[PDB]
Amino acid sequence: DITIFSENEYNEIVEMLRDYSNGDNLEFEVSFKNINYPNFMRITEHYINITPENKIESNNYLDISLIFPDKNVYRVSLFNQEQIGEFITKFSKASSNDISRYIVSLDPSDDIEIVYKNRGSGKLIGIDNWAITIKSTEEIPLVAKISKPKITGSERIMYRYKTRYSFTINKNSRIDITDVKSSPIIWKLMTVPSNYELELELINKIDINTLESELLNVFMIIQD
């Protein structure tokens, strides 16, 4: 019998879980900090071997994030491997203004996912003793009427090439483990050293005690 949350953290997260179940397009995520390569290998191997095939989703994609002055983000995800290659080749010498103009011109499809991340609605709680962050953010999917944000020329761009493995451990939870190549420069991206991201993403609201037990299970895999 071991606890993750203190009394104040428990009560604040309970309110976050309530807000999550009540608001449209809200996501609830528990991000694990300082995941390195051997952790990545252990986690991926652990879940691939025991998770049923239809509950395993594997995706290679490029996330282009346009960060506006208000700190909000317009993010385009390209899933088609050839379009990723064409984008990298055609825009390697282009300016941020030229790239941003092309990014907002793209229309959503099965290979192109678009989302507007309202970081102002963001609620973030760090659990210092367990190196995790509990976050709830609004992510509005722009699918195929779309009213896109205006390009002024003061946008910052961040590129993230991701190799993601997603495991649906039950009806309300999903483990996302990702090998990420991050860079604000296009031609550098595919060769920059990988950072590793691990998250427990909710599909539906759960009791905080169920959240505690699920997080403890992930910590048990990570720990040496």
Swiss-Prot record:
S-S bonds: none
Cell compartments where the protein resides: Virion
Signal peptide: none
Family: In the N-terminal section; belongs to the dsDNA virus mRNA guanylyltransferase family.
Task performed by this protein: Responsible for methylating the 5'-cap structure of mRNAs.
Name of the protein described by the UniProt record: Probable mRNA-capping enzyme
Organism: Acanthamoeba polyphaga mimivirus (APMV)
Organism lineage: Viruses, Varidnaviria, Bamfordvirae, Nucleocytoviricota, Megaviricetes
